[PDB]
Amino acid sequence: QNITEEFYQSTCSAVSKGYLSALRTGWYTSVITIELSNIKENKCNGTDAKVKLIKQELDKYKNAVTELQLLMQSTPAT
């Protein structure tokens, strides 16, 4: 990197040189995927401790799955 610049008093302007390109010319698509179970409401009453907690990380999970369903059938806004 030998960066360097010249001022032109004639035309009130300046050029910085010594740079190297990296231009976005094209695009690489690729599908990314996630597999999901769907399950019932079948659960439990109880419980000792470490499944009262595993049930909560599962409210959230369907909650999510619900929002993602809301994003139904349309062109996405660019």
Binding site: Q1, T11, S21, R24, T25, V31, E35
Partner: protein, 377 residues
Amino acid sequence: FLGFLLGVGSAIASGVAVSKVLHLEGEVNKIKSALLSTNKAVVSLSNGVSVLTFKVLDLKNYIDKQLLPILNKQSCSISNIETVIEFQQKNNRLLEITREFSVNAGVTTPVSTYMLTNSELLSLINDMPITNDQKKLMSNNVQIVRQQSYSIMSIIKEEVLAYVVQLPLYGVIDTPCWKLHTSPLCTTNTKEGSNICLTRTDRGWYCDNAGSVSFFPQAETCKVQSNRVFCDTMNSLTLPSEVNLCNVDIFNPKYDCKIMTSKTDVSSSVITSLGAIVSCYGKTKCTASNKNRGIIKTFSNGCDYVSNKGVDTVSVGNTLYYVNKQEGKSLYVKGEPIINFYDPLVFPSDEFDASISQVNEKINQSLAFIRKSDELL
């Protein structure tokens, strides 16, 4: 200034095209089945194109090693640790991802680490059908690549969530770019309002490209990173190599340099890669300092310049600008202010999109049908 000359694209048309395709009934299954229990497929579609597929998270085949492995000792009891840990987090990702699409109505950028982990990204980069310098470049600049990437929500279906990821191709690399800065140049003479200015409108980034030059008018659609310049051609013009001639010789016969006239002499500064241009006019206080020992130079009216060797900072009027501390060699090129070559009497003081020679024609027009329709009388 010239950004209004740009064309207008559809940044995620590529990506969406593929989303669209993922609603063909056969397609979704063709995918799941092709990742039978591999994690990187290459499913060609029932449109008929190749797309590196990628299961990154199996929750079905996780939940179903603790739906039945827990719908039995419960209801009710407890199981253990590890299983909570390695799910609390596994699920958590998804929750982020869902946040992300919901707020950005299905389209995110930059593409987040949740949407794609460095892990998964670099792997993608590795098996991308593209040159090796591309690979290294992308790998050493992932947070930029993420910035220029998009991620497009596509479908949630039976037991599967597909979203497309659009990643940059850097089809042009290691060619020489250069950056042009321009402030306005006016006459300095004393009567306020007796004065004419002219500016080069052609400021931007410029990069050599396939025998022509890509020109980027709005230079904040580019990110310098040390001495690499990431641009996007979507915001560029394709111009002749000759356009550089305007820097050595703005009058040259080969390319007709672009300018703007006005009578609006106002003081301003432009900070360059390695210095500072000052346009001082009127009663303005324009100065350059060293933080430590204060003011080291005072500018006269007109357009001047200082390098960042020694100078930390520049004030124009009530506007302090810190200078760029990048290291390099500046060179001042003394020259007669071209604005001194123009008779104010027949100068076009309102011209927003003009050239050097367009001004000339417009002058001759004035000059002629003055002098002719005059000795006439």
